[PDB]
Design an enzyme around this catalytic site. Sequence first.
Site, PDB file in Angstrom:
ATOM      1  N   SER A 182       0.893  -1.194  -0.100  1.00 47.47           N
ATOM      2  CA  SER A 182      -0.006   0.040  -0.036  1.00 47.47           C
ATOM      3  C   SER A 182       1.044   1.271   0.034  1.00 47.47           C
ATOM      4  CB  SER A 182      -1.057  -0.122   1.118  1.00 47.47           C
ATOM      5  OG  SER A 182      -1.919   1.161   1.071  1.00 47.47           O
TER       6      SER A 182
ATOM      7  N   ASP B  82      -3.078   5.923  -3.698  1.00 49.60           N
ATOM      8  CA  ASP B  82      -1.786   5.098  -2.909  1.00 49.60           C
ATOM      9  C   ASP B  82      -1.277   4.130  -3.911  1.00 49.60           C
ATOM     10  OD1 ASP B  82      -4.589   4.221  -2.500  1.00 49.60           O
ATOM     11  OD2 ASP B  82      -3.733   3.074  -0.718  1.00 49.60           O
TER      12      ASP B  82
ATOM     13  N   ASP C  64      -1.495   0.846  -3.942  1.00 49.11           N
ATOM     14  CA  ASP C  64      -2.097  -0.472  -4.361  1.00 49.11           C
ATOM     15  C   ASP C  64      -3.610   0.279  -4.504  1.00 49.11           C
ATOM     16  OD1 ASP C  64      -2.512   0.369  -1.776  1.00 49.11           O
ATOM     17  OD2 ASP C  64      -3.141  -1.748  -1.161  1.00 49.11           O
TER      18      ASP C  64
ATOM     19  N   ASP D  72      -6.134   1.477  -2.661  1.00 51.60           N
ATOM     20  CA  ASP D  72      -7.413   1.286  -1.899  1.00 51.60           C
ATOM     21  C   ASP D  72      -7.701   2.447  -0.898  1.00 51.60           C
ATOM     22  OD1 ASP D  72      -4.946   1.016  -0.293  1.00 51.60           O
ATOM     23  OD2 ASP D  72      -6.157   0.091   1.302  1.00 51.60           O
TER      24      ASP D  72
END
Lengths: 447, 446
Positions: free
Chosen positions: B98, B238, B240, B242
């Site tokens: 992340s 961000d 990843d 999410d």
Amino acid sequence: KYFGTDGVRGVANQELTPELAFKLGRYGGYVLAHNKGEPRVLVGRDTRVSGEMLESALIAGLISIGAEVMRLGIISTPGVAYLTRDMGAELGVMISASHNPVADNGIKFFGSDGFKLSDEQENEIEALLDQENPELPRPVGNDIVHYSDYFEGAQKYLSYLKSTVDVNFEGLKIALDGANGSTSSLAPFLFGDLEADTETIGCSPDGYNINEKCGSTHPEKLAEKVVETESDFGLAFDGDGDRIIAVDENGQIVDGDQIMFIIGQEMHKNQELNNDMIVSTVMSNLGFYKALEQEGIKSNKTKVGDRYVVEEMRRGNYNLGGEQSGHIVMMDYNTTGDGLLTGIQLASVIKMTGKSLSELAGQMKKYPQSLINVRVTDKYRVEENVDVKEVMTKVEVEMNGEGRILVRPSGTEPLVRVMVEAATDEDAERFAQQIADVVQDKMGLDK
Amino acid sequence: KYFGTDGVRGVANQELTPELAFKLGRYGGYVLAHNKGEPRVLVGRDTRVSGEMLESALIAGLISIGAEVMRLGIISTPGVAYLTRDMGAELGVMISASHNPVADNGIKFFGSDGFKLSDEQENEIEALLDQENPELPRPVGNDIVHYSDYFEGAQKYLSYLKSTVDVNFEGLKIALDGANGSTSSLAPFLFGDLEADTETIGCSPDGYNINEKCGSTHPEKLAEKVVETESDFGLAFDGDGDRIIAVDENGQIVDGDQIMFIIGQEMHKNQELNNDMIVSTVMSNLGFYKALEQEGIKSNKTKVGDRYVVEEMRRGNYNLGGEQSGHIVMMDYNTTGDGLLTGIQLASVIKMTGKSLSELAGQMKKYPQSLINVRVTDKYRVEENVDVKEVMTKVEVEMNGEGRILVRPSGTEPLVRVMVEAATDEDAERFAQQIADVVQDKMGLD
């Protein structure tokens, strides 16, 4: 010992596991990665489904030390050897079990010079295997490199093979068997591009059918196809493409000795054969040796195994050597046995002479062979044994000169191998039994 | 204990090794995927180098167990979650850390229902890691399956995101920051396909530049772009994808709380909001809760963490919840925090109203936050202490409605987190330091 005669081999996912493949990539890499900054390594494989899982495990090991991995995909073992030196890479890896069935798989390494690994390095790899927890580099962040997919390698290898021959194959009809192996995608293009008309079988791999009633080990269906299509000749390859067996226009089988003779004959006429000699193993038939004597080609015999043929060729700088099984090496072009290279070089001879395979192969007659195994105590004593020596002499005496006998032990097993070649099947079987009887009485532990 | 707050996280090749990634594929696959003969598992990753190395180790583990692996390449974590549910796949795996820097990486799992693993499932996997030699299936020959590339999935995920909106974005100019992450190749197409004019930065990943001076964690570079390109607003993602953070017309930052309020406001009037409630964590600011009182929306507070928000959402079947960090969940569309989805839904509300973000963000004021951490001798005596209770009690009386202090000890480390939210910075520090001073005097170090 993990390493055997030809790399690390075992049944995929139990004896040869992804954990082992990871260790071989990580440890094998470090052994070969203590001599170059940011090592460059290329990895190829054959058509076995287990190659996909082992490759990912191996590649992770190579990356974990900082190497630049180059995935070649499906390619023949000689392709890995050629590309490694041509690209100047530190190491090359081939994942295959050659002719063995799909369940088996293996890992083979190649040095920067295109040769198999040195034993000191092989043992160093095994020494790391012995350690439960060996400290090794663990690059992090920017230190790790991106791997790349080198799809070009296959055709770059094929273009090099095309460069070795100086004539096209138009007017020739050739049948090919890829054994559902790495050659499946290479041999049809290679011969088709050289203008040869092709009939193919064994070129439909599915990940489970490698070496399944096809390949050099099983040439029957190929001989069936050659006669059916009325092709000029046919060529059969093995799973990893280091061996070749040929079929003539009539469906007769041409072994490695005959193929070696045909190619060495032409090299001799052109004065390209180094020292007018051909390296081979003693297992090659007696007719092969006599034909070389007629052509004025000196013959060098070595112990059985690819290791010894290539070892002998490097020592004296000989350009041609091979085995009866079809593993043939042409030093001027490649550093290992290459079925594809040997196949085109054979076809080149057929094109230039205007002959047929049966005529070129018919130049040497193969004597009938009888083989027997006797389970003995301590294998060195056999040829020192007095009774064994004398019956061999008698047998040698009885054949005026028409035949020969060989008594060798097998390193894999604890028994001796009685080899007899004679004019007639009935003679060959008889001398073998006479000799085997004498050994069995006086050397049979397992009497 | 390998599992952390969000899967297994660590520095790639040091904290988490390819050997560990292999076991997570082998053991996690067996535990989580085996109710079908040849389980189908989906694997995705972000742009970090070592995502390639860890993936190969994981895939080897999955194949060695009998799984049918389908590679997805670079995709956002919600993409893995969404695709796992739509394909009827037994399990989905995402390789990413992340917002964390490039050196770190991690492994998160998703069940066939698109939700993260239960603590029971988490516990079972760790037990297998501890066993010296566990006898697991070892398929050979025909039993091993071919892995496959499902690069088509990425476009199916984008087409699904397009389906969630009922109107186009024509007339809008939007700036996007992909954090050099999975959104880099998805967000420009997704908003551009909706007719929005786009200016992007941070969409040139090289494997080492993820989350580097850009992204939701670093929105300064995007807000600069919004003003310079004279764009209506900007969205930051961000590594990843999410999380989502928004930027207004003027360059101010719009956090998850405000984004939750804007989206829930539109759902409420349209009655799309189930039970007229929004789930959130206690970490959420008071201004968010006060605005919920001005509107006709209820509110549920939960423990900090993605798991607990969604866990509460499933128990009562509420459709909206999220965190201040930007991790927002829309149950009607996805089962986890999805930055791309929230981005479309935020812009969707803007177009229907025809307003601007600053007017929509101005609906709630963010009270200033003061955070102090105090080394302590122990925390389970800190709440009981009379002197701490007395200053805190005095604090509750002084602010009758001015704000609230929150005091929350960390089990991880031997300190207490002292958080105070108040109307004015000058008030909060009068409360933040006074309380921290009292705590400091009693424990920590003589």
